[PDB]
Amino acid sequence: IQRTPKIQVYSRHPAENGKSNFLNCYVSGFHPSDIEVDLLKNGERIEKVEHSDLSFSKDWSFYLLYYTEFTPTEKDEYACRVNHVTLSQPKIVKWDRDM
Amino acid sequence: RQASIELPSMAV
Amino acid sequence: GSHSMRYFFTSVSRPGRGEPRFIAVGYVDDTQFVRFDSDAASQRMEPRAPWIEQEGPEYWDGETRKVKAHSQTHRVDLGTLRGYYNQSEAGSHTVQRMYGCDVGSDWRFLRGYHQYAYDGKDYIALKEDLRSWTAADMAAQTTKHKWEAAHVAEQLRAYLEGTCVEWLRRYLENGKETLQRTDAPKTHMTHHAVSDHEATLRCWALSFYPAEITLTWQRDGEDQTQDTELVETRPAGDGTFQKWAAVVVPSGQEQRYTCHVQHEGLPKPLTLRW
Ligand code: NA
């Protein structure tokens, strides 16, 4: 059974320009466990990214949290890029301070 | 704390 | 409130790229407390919460011994399962196991569970009576018989009703400052204009623990599910959780709508209005 990942991109704390925060990309509801997740700053891959230990829900589907320390500005674009077997091409979800 | 059952017993 | 202890185990075969990778994690409620990664540096069970560090060397050695033995059984299982289902040695396959126990507000046993999956679907599961097995398909019947013969359910029952409950209570006590706390959500509402004709109201709940929460919309005191969006509860990364609920409303009718928030940390439910 294969299941496609759900994706949420968000900050740990309410965003304030110029103040350090954490950028999160939560991937969940996927099967198999093989997945690629990158955080992007203005289209470029952020190098220093950590993640949670692989775990799963009642329905056996996997979840992971990917995260990096960052300082948001008015004029910087952040996104999460995800690839999985179920996806024809990588899926890019942009960060929205209000979501 | 994990279960202390002989793991070879619970092989499929 | 109620509490739980759960262990989750995952093994993945990758033929042509070495032997299987194994990951094990342990939770009390929504807090991870231990981990093991077969490819990691330590080759031991590792702490992930400050209170588990109160455990001595005998614990760490015993937990390490048991988790490594679990990785080895999964390696054997992966081969056994390919035979059962007549599969070739070329594909990647996944084995998963979960077990643990729930207790009530009195920290007394509510129920236990032990279940196994193969390639993303149910394989075999212990029933709520902790005496009998549910085999998902014909192949799993072979496993049911072996586990009946080896008296696995009896042994699991003793663990789930005794050891599991007792160690859960010990952890809740040892880690009282964090595990027994209730952080009430910090709540607010935003307003976004889609156009001249409609607006989106978003009800936020932030910095809460435990993860369990209910966000509901009402229009004139009546439950409103149409034209709403509710996101999955998500980890903030600092041990707390986040959630939002939104409703699309006609312009000039914003005041008819209320957001209702229910949470263990709240003595009475909150009502928010724009
Ligand atoms: Na034990």
XYZ file of C-alpha atoms and ligand atoms in Angstrom:
386
model
C 0.000 0.000 0.000
C 1.381 3.423 -0.999
C 0.198 6.742 0.476
C 1.172 10.264 -0.586
C 2.592 12.703 2.022
C 0.659 15.587 3.553
C 2.883 18.701 3.929
C 2.753 21.695 6.317
C 5.364 24.499 6.290
C 5.384 26.846 9.315
C 7.455 28.596 12.019
C 7.826 27.453 15.659
C 7.036 30.973 16.998
C 5.018 33.824 15.418
C 7.265 35.366 12.749
C 8.892 38.730 13.478
C 11.290 40.070 10.835
C 14.869 40.225 12.103
C 14.314 37.868 15.074
C 15.639 34.259 15.000
C 13.068 31.429 14.876
C 12.749 27.820 13.588
C 11.425 26.790 10.135
C 9.427 23.513 10.195
C 8.299 21.140 7.453
C 6.003 18.434 8.789
C 5.482 15.477 6.447
C 2.879 12.862 7.430
C 0.481 10.168 6.191
C 2.983 8.548 3.777
C 3.976 4.975 2.890
C 6.651 3.624 2.174
C 9.076 5.442 4.540
C 11.579 6.455 1.858
C 11.257 10.235 1.430
C 13.368 13.275 0.465
C 12.658 16.589 2.196
C 14.581 19.851 1.677
C 14.074 23.344 3.030
C 14.650 26.135 0.500
C 15.680 29.763 0.937
C 14.988 31.792 -2.240
C 14.992 28.536 -4.243
C 18.308 27.348 -2.781
C 18.719 24.261 -0.559
C 19.441 25.043 3.118
C 22.421 22.973 4.210
C 22.099 22.652 7.997
C 18.696 20.703 8.341
C 17.798 18.200 11.095
C 14.857 15.792 11.458
C 12.913 13.750 14.018
C 13.216 9.976 14.398
C 10.984 7.942 12.100
C 7.663 7.083 13.727
C 4.128 6.167 12.578
C 0.386 6.609 13.186
C -2.466 4.127 13.969
C -2.972 3.510 10.218
C 0.778 2.574 9.835
C 1.568 5.747 7.837
C 4.824 7.557 8.662
C 5.477 11.091 9.918
C 8.641 13.210 10.187
C 9.486 16.759 11.258
C 12.288 18.562 9.393
C 13.629 21.812 10.882
C 16.233 24.544 10.664
C 17.076 27.685 12.631
C 16.384 30.849 10.583
C 15.839 34.634 10.714
C 12.819 35.690 8.582
C 12.772 38.986 6.641
C 10.191 40.872 4.548
C 12.092 39.979 1.344
C 13.137 36.321 1.647
C 11.177 33.343 0.297
C 11.060 30.030 2.164
C 9.650 26.691 0.978
C 9.719 22.934 1.534
C 10.449 20.548 -1.350
C 9.368 16.906 -1.040
C 9.865 13.826 -3.242
C 8.363 10.333 -2.700
C 7.511 7.304 -4.950
C 3.883 8.431 -5.078
C 4.879 11.789 -6.570
C 5.441 12.287 -10.298
C 7.773 15.249 -9.596
C 8.927 17.038 -6.381
C 6.191 19.019 -4.572
C 7.063 22.566 -3.402
C 5.006 24.206 -0.651
C 5.806 27.850 0.163
C 5.964 29.195 3.716
C 3.084 31.538 4.615
C 3.435 33.415 7.949
C -0.357 33.221 8.267
C -0.720 29.433 7.836
C 10.387 -0.093 29.414
C 10.209 -2.677 26.603
C 8.583 -6.133 26.831
C 10.879 -8.959 28.083
C 9.554 -11.732 25.876
C 12.008 -14.013 24.067
C 12.022 -12.394 20.625
C 12.582 -15.680 18.624
C 9.195 -16.799 20.050
C 7.463 -13.842 18.382
C 9.038 -14.414 14.967
C 6.356 -14.531 12.239
C -6.279 13.161 32.407
C -5.516 9.832 30.729
C -2.020 8.647 29.725
C -0.292 6.126 27.406
C 3.066 4.443 26.764
C 3.885 3.298 23.200
C 6.820 1.726 21.343
C 7.056 1.820 17.504
C 9.457 -0.417 15.494
C 10.207 -0.198 11.733
C 12.486 -2.355 9.562
C 13.081 -1.792 5.835
C 14.887 -4.173 3.449
C 16.828 -2.600 0.576
C 18.242 -5.459 -1.555
C 21.512 -4.520 -3.269
C 22.154 -1.773 -0.686
C 23.182 -3.815 2.350
C 21.201 -5.365 5.189
C 17.925 -3.916 6.636
C 17.731 -0.602 8.521
C 15.915 -0.650 11.925
C 14.437 2.347 13.886
C 12.734 2.086 17.309
C 11.124 4.944 19.268
C 9.330 5.101 22.658
C 6.689 7.666 23.728
C 4.921 8.628 26.950
C 1.760 10.425 25.730
C 3.072 12.860 23.045
C 6.663 13.033 24.385
C 9.386 10.864 22.830
C 11.720 9.497 25.510
C 13.960 6.851 23.852
C 15.330 5.999 20.379
C 17.458 3.340 18.621
C 18.811 3.586 15.073
C 20.693 0.510 13.820
C 22.918 2.741 11.602
C 23.685 5.346 14.280
C 26.958 5.975 16.173
C 26.233 4.711 19.717
C 24.697 1.272 18.977
C 22.706 1.765 22.224
C 19.224 2.794 23.300
C 19.469 6.607 23.731
C 17.670 9.187 25.957
C 15.367 11.819 24.369
C 13.824 13.338 27.540
C 15.589 14.620 30.732
C 13.676 12.337 33.148
C 14.752 9.059 31.522
C 18.346 9.978 32.400
C 17.410 9.050 35.998
C 17.639 5.405 34.906
C 20.887 3.561 35.787
C 23.282 1.413 33.672
C 21.306 -1.848 34.201
C 18.305 -0.250 32.425
C 20.329 1.106 29.497
C 22.061 -2.284 29.047
C 18.781 -4.195 29.259
C 16.927 -1.843 26.905
C 19.855 -1.994 24.436
C 19.909 -5.838 24.621
C 16.150 -6.106 23.935
C 16.069 -3.575 21.062
C 19.016 -5.171 19.226
C 17.319 -8.575 19.583
C 14.170 -7.008 18.069
C 16.180 -5.790 15.041
C 17.447 -9.355 14.496
C 13.960 -10.890 14.676
C 12.725 -8.365 12.101
C 15.604 -9.366 9.766
C 14.396 -12.986 10.003
C 10.725 -11.881 9.588
C 11.476 -10.041 6.338
C 12.786 -13.269 4.750
C 9.948 -15.375 6.179
C 7.335 -12.929 4.773
C 8.793 -12.984 1.246
C 8.352 -16.777 1.258
C 4.774 -16.662 2.601
C 3.729 -14.193 -0.141
C 5.896 -15.776 -2.870
C 7.851 -12.570 -3.542
C 11.224 -12.118 -5.196
C 14.359 -10.928 -3.383
C 14.546 -7.823 -5.617
C 11.942 -5.547 -3.995
C 12.141 -3.351 -0.911
C 9.723 -4.378 1.902
C 8.606 -2.938 5.274
C 7.866 -4.576 8.652
C 6.252 -2.530 11.475
C 5.312 -3.397 15.073
C 3.572 -1.337 17.747
C 2.705 -2.094 21.393
C 1.816 -0.299 24.606
C -0.850 0.436 27.215
C -3.409 3.117 28.152
C -4.319 4.234 31.686
C -7.106 6.513 32.982
C -6.968 9.573 35.273
C -6.491 7.170 38.229
C -3.463 5.698 36.377
C -5.262 2.337 36.267
C -5.136 -0.013 33.235
C -7.637 0.774 30.441
C -6.348 -1.331 27.537
C -3.308 -2.900 25.897
C -2.296 -3.396 22.279
C 0.236 -5.350 20.186
C 0.026 -5.312 16.387
C 2.100 -6.053 13.312
C 2.035 -4.776 9.714
C 3.723 -5.830 6.436
C 4.120 -3.432 3.467
C 1.734 -0.786 4.880
C -1.189 -3.070 5.814
C -2.417 -5.083 8.840
C -0.762 -8.505 9.266
C -1.697 -9.733 12.780
C -3.077 -8.022 15.904
C -3.769 -8.937 19.529
C -7.464 -8.482 20.399
C -8.695 -6.244 23.268
C -9.206 -9.300 25.550
C -5.415 -9.912 25.283
C -6.011 -13.680 24.778
C -6.831 -14.057 21.088
C -5.371 -13.034 17.677
C -6.763 -11.316 14.547
C -5.041 -12.548 11.372
C -5.567 -10.130 8.437
C -5.299 -12.739 5.678
C -4.542 -16.385 4.856
C -0.759 -15.944 5.168
C -1.110 -14.477 8.681
C -2.954 -17.639 9.836
C 0.420 -19.456 9.858
C 1.787 -16.840 12.288
C -1.369 -17.044 14.435
C -0.774 -20.785 15.022
C 2.947 -20.353 15.967
C 2.130 -17.594 18.435
C -0.686 -19.715 19.886
C 1.787 -22.605 20.303
C 4.506 -20.435 21.876
C 1.944 -18.870 24.243
C 2.836 -15.312 23.172
C -0.548 -13.750 24.151
C -0.246 -14.899 27.774
C 3.242 -13.367 28.008
C 2.151 -10.128 26.292
C -0.882 -9.901 28.594
C 1.332 -10.066 31.700
C 3.533 -7.261 30.280
C 0.641 -5.038 29.158
C -1.341 -5.332 32.431
C 1.696 -5.253 34.783
C 5.117 -3.967 33.652
C 3.713 -1.521 31.065
C 1.392 0.214 33.567
C 3.977 0.252 36.377
C 6.757 1.788 34.254
C 4.351 4.333 32.755
C 3.472 5.494 36.323
C 7.166 5.602 37.286
C 7.929 7.806 34.258
C 4.913 10.099 35.008
C 6.257 10.523 38.568
C 9.951 10.922 37.659
C 9.038 13.450 34.931
C 6.122 15.165 36.698
C 7.281 18.728 35.945
C 6.894 18.141 32.188
C 4.745 15.022 31.661
C 2.007 16.013 34.085
C 1.808 19.665 32.996
C -1.071 21.104 30.974
C -0.155 24.054 28.784
C -3.387 25.848 27.777
C -3.439 27.063 24.148
C -2.560 30.690 23.396
C -5.430 31.692 21.096
C -6.177 34.479 18.578
C -8.205 35.133 15.385
C -7.053 36.568 12.050
C -9.084 38.155 9.218
C -8.074 37.898 5.557
C -9.987 39.450 2.657
C -10.338 37.058 -0.285
C -12.212 39.862 -2.116
C -15.123 42.275 -1.717
C -17.567 39.341 -1.495
C -16.021 37.077 1.180
C -13.492 36.901 4.039
C -11.589 34.121 5.831
C -11.559 33.986 9.659
C -8.748 31.844 11.119
C -8.865 30.642 14.712
C -5.389 29.808 16.105
C -4.266 27.628 19.013
C -0.560 27.726 19.903
C 1.914 26.451 22.540
C -0.369 23.729 23.930
C 0.329 20.336 25.546
C -0.895 17.570 25.356
C -1.664 17.345 21.597
C -5.364 16.461 22.116
C -7.577 19.476 21.221
C -10.926 20.395 19.627
C -11.521 23.524 17.493
C -15.111 24.110 16.274
C -16.935 26.915 14.425
C -20.481 28.036 15.115
C -22.793 30.480 13.288
C -25.364 32.010 15.675
C -24.641 29.325 18.270
C -24.996 26.492 15.771
C -22.338 24.070 14.537
C -20.805 25.059 11.215
C -18.844 22.490 9.176
C -19.568 23.684 5.601
C -16.972 26.128 4.157
C -14.417 25.263 6.868
C -10.823 24.008 6.818
C -9.121 22.243 9.754
C -5.394 21.419 9.609
C -3.796 18.395 11.301
C -2.334 19.146 14.745
C 1.394 19.724 14.251
C 4.554 19.774 16.406
C 6.098 23.198 17.146
C 9.489 21.522 17.826
C 9.778 22.661 21.452
C 7.500 19.989 22.947
C 4.289 21.916 22.258
C 1.645 21.710 19.522
C -0.171 24.021 17.047
C -3.544 23.908 15.235
C -5.867 26.134 13.255
C -9.450 26.179 11.990
C -10.746 28.555 9.283
C -14.181 29.478 7.850
C -15.032 31.414 4.663
C -17.869 33.860 5.366
C -19.847 36.467 3.377
C -18.613 40.060 3.892
C -20.555 41.930 6.609
C -21.575 38.690 8.416
C -18.300 38.099 10.366
C -20.014 38.756 13.734
C -22.320 35.750 13.397
C -19.340 33.367 13.677
C -17.610 32.081 16.840
C -14.632 29.726 17.330
C -14.831 27.278 20.246
C -11.680 25.779 21.838
C -11.601 22.690 24.111
C -8.399 21.527 25.903
C -7.301 19.804 29.165
C -5.467 22.977 30.218
C -8.690 24.997 29.994
C -10.996 24.834 33.083
C -13.888 25.813 30.768
C -13.995 26.051 26.925
C -13.027 29.336 25.236
C -15.180 31.221 22.746
C -13.483 33.557 20.260
C -15.179 36.157 18.044
C -13.727 38.585 15.466
Na 10.207 -5.794 30.759
